[PDB]
Design a protein around this ligand. Sequence first.
Ligand SMILES: CC(=O)N[C@@H]1[C@@H](O)[C@@H](O)[C@@H](CO)O[C@H]1O
Length: 325
Amino acid sequence: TFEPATDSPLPVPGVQYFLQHVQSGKYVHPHGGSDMPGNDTALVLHHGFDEKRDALRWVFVNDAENKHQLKHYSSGKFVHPKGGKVGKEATLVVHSSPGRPETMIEMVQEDGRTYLRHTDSDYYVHPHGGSPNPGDNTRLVYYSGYRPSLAFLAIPAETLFVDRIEIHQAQALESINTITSLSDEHRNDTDQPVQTSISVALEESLQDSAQLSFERCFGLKVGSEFEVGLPLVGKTKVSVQFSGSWKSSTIKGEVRTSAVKVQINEHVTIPPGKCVQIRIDTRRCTKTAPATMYLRTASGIEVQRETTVTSTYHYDQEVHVVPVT
Ligand SMILES: CC(=O)N[C@@H]1[C@@H](O)[C@@H](O)[C@@H](CO)O[C@H]1O
């Protein structure tokens, strides 16, 4: 299963998220839930959720213009300490004023969980009163230190398009192997040559597969199925069709074009008194590489996600009639 505390993805800057306090399940809203909250309106936790509500959406900003800020998607307001100083019980509020070093806020990983933290400080984001299950409309504050109960989950709140995945060629590992299948023995106990049907079923032996793996979870929404060209043996690209969920730590990939045969059917003239076998020799490329996924928002920002590509691919099949003596 997806374990929200141990699998929570780190948010990608410029992408829309919902913020969820893991322990309560409550979401981060401006107080009053407006899409146009006022200056010095508090961030609070509330059970309320509606995928379609833009006032629920937040965007992590980290660019030349703004370093380590959090933005309210519907209003464009940044998240500030109330009064302009991060300190004990300083309420998080939205405000139209641009961000500063003294307002920095980012999601960070500490001992396997994701937390909101004022950058370059020991201040993290707590629910006022520090309850593992705060009540609706509890305000979020800055406070020294962190503990599991404060963990947040950034849930992707828009669907991206996967443009391409680029293998890191220098750390790409390749293990080539020969899968050898022998049919049953067939013997010709007549006094004339018999042309005999010999079949072998190799569906489970020669199953092709591709996997994208992530330390926590993919953490992006990209649709039901997506297709990319992956180099499944040497540098030769093959079309792989992936389906998963943002919560997946492993996305399974299907190979469209099979390069070998999984049903072997040979017509073999067996001479009088002779025994034969079909020998199938199939090559398997077992591959692993770090890779960068390149994805696009509808708003047109290109974003990246590191992954590990793993694949089993079968090529260069040979069939031979071997004598059984
Ligand atoms: C020991 C303890 O839980 N203290 C918490 C403190 O850590 C912080 O979460 C604060 C925020 O208001 O609430 C307090 O109750």
